[model samples]
Target: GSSGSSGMALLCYNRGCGQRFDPETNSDDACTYHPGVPVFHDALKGWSCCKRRTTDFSDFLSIVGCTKGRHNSEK
Candidate 1:
């Protein structure tokens, strides 16, 4: 997912529609464009279109939590 002032943009890198999210002023349009499919943030940024959903943000958090630079193993 990519979001700017223009709004959220989602993309499906997998099969199926392989749709590129059309940017919108709100989440409704984006959701309408790609319903049910999950969108990933460009870099897990909080403002990313992918973060629009709670589950999406949780996924990002999981990925971010496992990332090398940011996470420290409990010692």
Candidate 2:
């Protein structure tokens, strides 16, 4: 079976780049995500840029993010 979006395979340590990516692909804008710090409140969490606090752990992290960027892999 093929892995559908498997991380810990080769992932980025940045705040929002959630996918495993090729090094060259990540050079420009392979990742489209938010640079905002995550704020996890009581039973809620969301980026500072958007007040639309997502209420579920699964849904909240699925945030569409903002701006254009590439993966910043630290590991």
Compute each candidate's TM-score over C-alphas: 0.19, 0.62
Give the range of the ten consecutive residues with the poorest summed lDDT in model 2: 6-15
lDDT (CA) per prediction? 0.32, 0.68
lDDT leader: 2
lDDT for residue 53 in candidate 2, whole number 0-100? 82
Error of 2 at 57 (Å): 2.0
Error of 2 at 3 (Å): 15
lDDT of 2 by residue, 1-75 (tens): 975763345476656557666675565556666777788887788887666588888877787766566676663
For model 2, how many clashes?
0
TM-score attained by model 1: 0.19
Task: Give the per-residue lDDT of model 1 (tens digit) for 29-57.
Answer: 22222222344445433322233433455
